[PDB]
Amino acid sequence: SLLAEFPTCPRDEKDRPRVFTAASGAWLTDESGFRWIDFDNARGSILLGHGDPVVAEAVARAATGADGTATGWSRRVDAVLERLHALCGGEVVGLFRSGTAAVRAAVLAVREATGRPLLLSAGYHGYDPMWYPSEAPLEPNADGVVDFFFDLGLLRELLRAPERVAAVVVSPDHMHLSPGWYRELRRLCSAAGVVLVADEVKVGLRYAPGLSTAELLAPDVWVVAKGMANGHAVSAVGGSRRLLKPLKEVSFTSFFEPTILAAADAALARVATGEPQRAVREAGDRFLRHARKALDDASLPVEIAGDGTFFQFVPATEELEEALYGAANAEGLLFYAGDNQGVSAAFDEAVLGEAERRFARVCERLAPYAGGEPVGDAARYRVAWNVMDGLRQAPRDREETTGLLARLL
């Protein structure tokens, strides 16, 4: 207990972190020698697979100084910028050292550029205190952030006074929000004349070789990170020259560190082909068909939201959800507990076959829960909240919305 932070990671029954010695492709080794198949994948930042051979060679080389120096510019800086710009659009691009740092810099630049105070937010934007919850729903926090919890009725209300709004900033979820959700969000922002920031730290580059919301939102500013460097310490922002002009005041010491630029340039190259995204979709979709039949044949009341790119178990009770991850653990399948499961491209037939096999065995372990009452909406809203930090799309009136927020906050 030297560690001052509480990092999100695999934890065991005593909530102590699982210690992993090694990993390659889709497989992990733990400290007891027990081997796992990884559906966490550093929260979906491992798009390609652990230890990816070709990224590894580019990073190993950069470490020797052969591609440049942390002292200053290298043409790999130009290549990473150029790639991102091609993939995501906009006029300008900036690089940062986490998703957190990127989203904060982007929204503060917009606030400065527009001269307006309030940020209207849905979703998680990172650990920084600027995003901490207000004393009550719909009121601005200490840093001028109002959370609207992906409720478009609440957003529409807020946008009836757009003079005070620097930007709307949204973290997509494609498991729990439909395409028409996003189009309504875009229509409302455009009618109000308000800047739209897509926080694609998680979803950017994974659904497509580009922004998952490039056409759905056509955002004024974007942020990506998890998809861009197979796990390495980099994020990016882009959009219009005028709104990001304040980013000119950003500099940081490690900006030119070559191994990160190596990893980003290698990983982005594949990202740009479409293939790893196809492979993950196709692979996790295979695994999903299989998992859904196994839960069904087993009479287990667990729905699965989403798709091969990201999916989430939605069990009918919290008891069952815990048992589920209990059994998965017992079988060497590493899920990100309660959150979204994101396979990597290292999910070939061998892995899929074993994972399917290990999932059947999870269903076997779970047979005491066979025939429980099927999934209701309270479970769906609970489980979606854990992944999105706000409300899944479903029909509701204002009273229902208010009740949900009271319950879940």
Next chain:
Amino acid sequence: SLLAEFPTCPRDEKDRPRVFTAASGAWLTDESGFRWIDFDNARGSILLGHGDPVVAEAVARAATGADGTATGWSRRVDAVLERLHALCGGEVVGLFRSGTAAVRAAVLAVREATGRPLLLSAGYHGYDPMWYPSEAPLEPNADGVVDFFFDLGLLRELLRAPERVAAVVVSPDHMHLSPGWYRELRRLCSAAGVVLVADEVKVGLRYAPGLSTAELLAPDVWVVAKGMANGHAVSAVGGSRRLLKPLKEVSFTSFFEPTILAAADAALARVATGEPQRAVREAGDRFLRHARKALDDASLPVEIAGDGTFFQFVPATEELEEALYGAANAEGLLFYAGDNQGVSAAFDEAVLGEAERRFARVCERLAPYAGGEPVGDAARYRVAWNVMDGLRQAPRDREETTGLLARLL
């Protein structure tokens, strides 16, 4: 023109970044094949030297999968936390992705833990807007920060109402502030009952295996970064468990990324022994003896502040400053222009012998500046302001302090 940021880096006479294609030890090669001896060394974060073989090999093995996974905890997390704790003291340790992020998190944690609004600051703390200047000297900015510019007179004033003060946060400079200055700062903060945060992002682990101000300040909370990983993207905060409890709320996606953890463990192993810091001190002091002698023999009105660990040229005039770096640029000595020079442990006998010959050539180019009026205090103040973003220690009354602030802000 894709980059939205304006990174600090070596820039040519047209203000364009120099392009470096490779580096090894003390030496850089640029896009034209010109070879440079590096005194900038990623703003001092390259303590060991470019492409340090042991670190590079730690990084290579970690990029394979064989030395931990981004998905979660590893034995190298413990080794890093343990090492920092041993070198720097305190009860807990936290890891971050840049000095900016680390100092922001540290100070916000102290603000939350004490419950008091104001941060009293000297020095540079990172690019974040929380540090932007106030409307007037001695007024807090919009984020509750009041800059005292290293003037203990001004600090005493601000310490007259300490109930409102969460911390004093200071970035040391050992070229322009004496040991007695630190002791008095220490005294002051203790009498006022205020928390002292030493921002050792630059100086930590470089003057000694641990904190430069360990004895002088005995700070409540410390921050280090540039010393810990031979340029790789990590920083650390440590100190009181109580004061850093708010850091429990920190998590980021790349926390377990293995190449950075390996680089840090390998670098900190070397740092703990005291050897690289001794090598740097001795190598730099040797260069300084030669440089001071060459300047004097040439009748050039340029002093040198500092020592082998970090030194700064202090030219009598801005014209002569620009001529100095122009001449150094022509001879392939890469100085961090106007700022501090920080050699690495790869500065061996052969590097020093060539740097001496190059600096002799520099002084020959500056012949036309021979015999100019000797350095005055206005020059010393302007030059020191560039490295510390505040006032070098020297006798002043308040009016003169005020006067300097008006001049240099």
